[PDB]
Amino acid sequence: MISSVCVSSYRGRKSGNKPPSKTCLKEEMA
């Protein structure tokens, strides 16, 4: 996950996750 601190846990489809094909929808602070 980050800095070798966490692995990943579960896939990326928990009914609400960042999609790889759709990563351009202002996910930052507005």
Swiss-Prot record:
- Coiled-coil portions: none
Q: How is it modified after translation?
A: Phosphorylation of serine residues in the inactivation gate inhibits rapid channel closure.
PTM-bearing positions, type Phosphoserine: 8-9, 15, 21
Result after altering residue 15 to D: Slightly decreased rate of channel inactivation. Loss of channel inactivation
**Residue segments, region Disordered:** 1-24
Q: Where in the cell is it found?
A: Membrane
Phenotype upon changing residue 8 to A: Decreased inhibition of channel closure by PKC. Inhibition of channel closure is nearly abolished
Q: Where is this region: Inactivation gate?
A: 1-28
Superkingdom of this protein's organism:
Eukaryota
Functionally, this protein is described as follows: Voltage-gated potassium channel that opens in response to the voltage difference across the membrane, forming a potassium-selective channel through which potassium ions pass in accordance with their electrochemical gradient. The channel displays rapid activation and inactivation kinetics.
Q: How does it assemble?
A: Homotetramer. Heterotetramer of potassium channel proteins.
Q: What is known of its domains?
A: The cytoplasmic N-terminus mediates N-type inactivation.
Of which family is this protein a member?
A: Belongs to the potassium channel family. C (Shaw) (TC 1.A.1.2) subfamily. Kv3.4/KCNC4 sub-subfamily.
Q: What is this protein called?
A: Voltage-gated potassium channel KCNC4
- The species this protein belongs to is Homo sapiens
Range within the parent protein: 1 to 30 of 635
